[PDB]
Each structure stands twice: as C-alpha cells, then as structure tokens.
Amino acid sequence: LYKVNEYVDARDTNMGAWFEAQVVRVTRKAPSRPALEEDVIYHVKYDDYPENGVVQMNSRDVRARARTIIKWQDLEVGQVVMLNYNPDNPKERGFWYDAEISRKRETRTARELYANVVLGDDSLNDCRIIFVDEVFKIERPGEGSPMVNPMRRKSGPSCKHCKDDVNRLCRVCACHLCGGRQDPDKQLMCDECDMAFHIYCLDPPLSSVPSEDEWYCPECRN
C-alpha cells in the first residue's frame, strides 16, 4: 500500500481527471463481504488545490505519481496512457486524463496523435491530442519505487503572471487591490469582470460577505 507523505495522483470522479496529490493518512476499514480484502481509504491533500483540503479517497482513485514519459516514437496504438487534454478548448492545454491511443500519424507539417479519452461519464473517442511529448506511462500497482523528487506536470489552469506561486502577490489571480491570497472566503468575485476583492480592501470595507444575488466591483458601477 502507498505510504504516508507519498506523492501520488488522485482522480476527480466528477471529471475523470488526475491530480498531483500527497498522502496525509491511511485508514484501513474492514470488509463488508466475505473473502473481500480490507478497504484502504487514503486521506490526501492536493499539491495545487489545498483549498479543497484533505479529502477521503478510495484506493481505485489513487495511484503512484506519474514519473515516466513515453517518447513519440515509442507510442503504439492500443496503449493506455495518461496525457493532457482540454474538453473546453482542444487546441489549448487542459487537464490530465487516461486515454487509449487510437491513431498515430506523422505528416509533413506536424506529428498527430489521437486517443480515446476517459472523462467523468465515459470515453471521448479519437480526440486530437496536441501535447504529444508529454505522454505518461501509468504506474502499475506492484512495480515501481516510492516517490518520497516530485515529478510535477504543467497543468491547464495556471496564471501567466504569478505562475500560481503562493509566495507572490498577484492582482490577477487574487485580490485585485492588495494582491493577497489570504481569507479567500472573504473575497468577493465581480460578476462582470471576474476580479476578486477582499471585503476589507474595499473602500468602504464590509464586515462579512453580502447575501445578494449579483455583485459588481466599483469599476463595473457598484
């Protein structure tokens, strides 16, 4: 079983995407049915989604962090791998999915990869994969070696300006005024420009979050 502090991937069952995570605790629950193995529950924190906090996860939704990249030339059809895709904008970078390679081709213009991409619901067949050099071998149970040297991956939603670095201020990511990431619960989101504002950084400030439908910032006439 995966150890405490072990860097791992964790699968968001709503969307099928895999996410860098770190094991915080391991709870071993006893089986409901005879001849069934004990149920390992992993409590995990997300590397770049700490806001979610520690989450309970089933051992099927957790596997050893992805370490090895398979090279273009080494990819063959039928292979199941983890690769990047964006269901909102396939040209642009997105999230990390498990997919079965369906078509591989090399034109004079560029190298093309297609795979069936597993999402929350089901597959998505013969998708045009564009990050062709960032195709990860899925770490198989049993084989490998604990990752206690994190192999980070470039993920879709990053900020161009602060690179999501939590030790930098940013007036894009975070509060538009101070650029601070603290008390995000007390940061109103403009319903027009989608900018964030601490309640206390507003002038005049607010003591708590308004209970109305929409909220606009000053610039957006409020």
Binding site: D12, M15, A17, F19, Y49, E51, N52, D88, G94, F95, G156, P157, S158, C159, K160, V172, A174, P184, D185, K186, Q187, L188, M189, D191, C193, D194, M195, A196, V209, P210, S211, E212, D213, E214, W215
Partner: peptide, 25 residues
C-alpha cells in the same frame, strides 16, 4: 454571492475564469 474560494475549488471554473480575465478586451 460568488467567492474566490468557490472558484478555486472548481478546477474547470478556475480555468474558465483565467481565460475570461486574460481575453476580455
């Protein structure tokens, strides 16, 4: 009313925000 925390939780919404922000004008 919507908060940054509620966004930062939803990985899609998080990403969708960034685009709305960067490609606006």
């Amino acid at each position: 009313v919507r908060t940054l925390l509620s966004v930062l939780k939803d990985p899609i919404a998080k990403m969708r925000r960034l685009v709305r922000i960067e490609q606006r004008q």
